[PDB]
Amino acid sequence: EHVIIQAEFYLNPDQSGEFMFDFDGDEIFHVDMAKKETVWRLEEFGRFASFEAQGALANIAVDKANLEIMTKRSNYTPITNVPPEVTVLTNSPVELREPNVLICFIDKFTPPVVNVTWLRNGKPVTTGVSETVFLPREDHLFRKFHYLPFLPSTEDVYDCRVEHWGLDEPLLKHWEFD
C-alpha cells in the first residue's frame, strides 16, 4: 500500500508556484522555478531517475490560467487564512558537544506563504540552515520543515520564529538542552 502525489500550487497575487512529487508523505523532488531545475530531496535519487523540469514550468502556467478563471467565477472569494502550529525537535537524542540538527516543523497552514527565522540566544542564524518547499497534507493545508545543524551546549538557547498572515503575533517555539 503506497501513495504517490503530484502536488502543485499557484498563488495570487504573490505569483508563487511550486511543483513537487510526494511518496508516502516524503518529497521525491521539486522543481526550482527560477533555475528551471529539478531538485531531488536526496541527492542519490537523481542517480536512479530523471525529470524534465520544463514540463513542471508548463504545468504552472496552466495552473495560473486556471486560477484566474476560477477566481473570477467565484466572484473573487479569497482564501481563509489558517495559522500554522509549530514544533521544534531534534534529529536524535541530544548529547552535549555531539553534532545534532534542530528541526522546525511548520504544520497545518494555508496559504503557502511563511517567514521563518532561526534564533540563537535571540540572534538570527543563517549558517548551514536549510528548508523544504511547501509539502501537501491530506486536509490540503501545507507542511514545511526548516533545519539548523547545531552543537548542543548548556550556553545556547534556540527559537524558531514563524510569521504567517493567519497569526496575530510571531510564533516562537523554544528549544534548550535539559
Binding site: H2, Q6, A7, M70, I79
Partner: protein, 200 residues
C-alpha cells in the same frame, strides 16, 4: 527512468487566491490494484475530481460543475483520464520503486531514564527509536519477560521530512534494583526484533 508528470486539463492584507492540483496514485499490492485521482482545489476547496474507480469527472462543489460536464462530454479528454492508471501511475511506480518502495533504513534504538517533572528519582524509561525508514514500526516495553502494556506514552510517528522517522515511547516507572527492562523494536529493515536492555 523518466518520471512523467500529469498535465491535466484546462478550465499584507490584500486577498489571496490559491489553486491546488493534486494528482494521486494509490497502489495496493504493488501495481496489482492502482487508483488514480485528478483533483483540483480552489482556496482549499475541492471543485472537480476524476476518480479512476468512478470512470468520469465529478463536481465536488458547484464551482466545478461546468468543467465536470464539459470534460465528461469529450471522448478524448475522458479516455486520457481513464488511461492514467497505466500511462502515469504504473509508469512512475516502475521508475521510483527501487529507492522508495524498497527503501529500508535501520533504526537506532537507545534507552535512558528521564523525569515527568522536576523530581528526585527518575520516573520514566524512554525508548528512543530514530532514523528509520519506512514509518511502520512497533515498540514494546518488557519487564522481565512480561510485556508492560499499562503506563506508556508515545510521541507517535514523527516524520523528520528527510526520509527518516523518529519515535519515543515512555514507560512510567520508578525502577527498582534487580529489575531488567527491555525495549523491543520491530521494523522491516531487520529480520528479527530488536531488543535493548536497561538495568537499574
Amino acid at each position: 527512468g523518466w518520471i512523467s508528470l500529469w498535465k491535466g486539463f484546462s478550465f499584507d492584507t490584500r486577498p489571496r487566491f490559491l489553486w491546488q492540483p493534486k494528482r494521486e496514485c494509490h497502489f495496493f499490492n504493488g501495481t496489482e490494484r492502482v487508483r488514480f485521482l485528478d483533483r483540483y482545489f480552489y482556496n482549499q476547496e475541492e471543485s472537480v475530481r476524476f476518480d479512476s474507480d468512478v470512470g468520469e469527472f465529478r463536481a465536488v462543489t458547484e464551482l466545478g460543475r461546468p468543467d465536470a460536464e464539459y470534460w465528461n462530454s469529450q471522448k478524448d479528454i475522458l479516455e486520457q483520464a481513464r488511461a492514467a492508471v497505466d500511462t502515469y501511475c504504473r509508469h512512475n511506480y516502475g521508475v521510483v520503486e527501487s529507492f522508495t518502495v524498497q527503501r529500508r533504513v535501520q533504526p537506532k534504538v537507545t534507552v535512558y531514564p528521564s523525569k515527568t517533572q522536576p523530581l528526585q528519582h527518575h520516573n520514566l524509561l524512554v525508548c528512543s527509536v530514530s532514523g528509520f525508514y519506512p514509518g511502520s514500526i512497533e515498540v514494546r516495553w518488557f519487564l522481565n519477560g512480561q510485556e508492560e502494556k499499562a503506563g506508556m506514552v508515545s510521541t507517535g510517528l514523527i516524520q523528520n521530512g528527510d526520509w527518516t522517522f523518529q519515535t519515543l515511547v515512555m514507560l512510567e516507572t520508578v525502577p527498582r534494583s534487580g529489575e531488567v527492562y527491555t525495549c523491543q523494536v520491530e521494523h522491516p529493515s531487520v529480520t528479527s526484533p530488536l531488543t535493548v536492555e536497561w538495568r537499574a
